Amino acid sequence: SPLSIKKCPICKADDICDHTLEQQQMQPLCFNCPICDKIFPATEKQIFEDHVFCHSL
Ligand SMILES: [Zn+2]
Numbered sequence: 247s248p249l250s251i252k253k254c255p256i257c258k259a260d261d262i263c264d265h266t267l268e269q270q271q272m273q274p275l276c277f278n279c280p281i282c283d284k285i286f287p288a289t290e291k292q293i294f295e296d297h298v299f300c301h302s303l
Pocket of ligand 1: 279280281282283284297298301
């Protein structure tokens with residue numbers, strides 16, 4: 247165990263905001279894109295993130 251409070255930053259660009267520790271301690275089971283109506287399994291979170299990103303880029 248690392249002991250003491252020590253959270254690793256996911257992104258530097260996002261650091262400039264309220265990431266909320268509660269969000270880090272939560273692993274979704276499924277995802278649903280409200281922009282394309284596509285579902286992404288918890289394991290596809292990475293693919294989902296890229297998918298949702300494409301809609302923001
Ligand atoms: Zn989509």
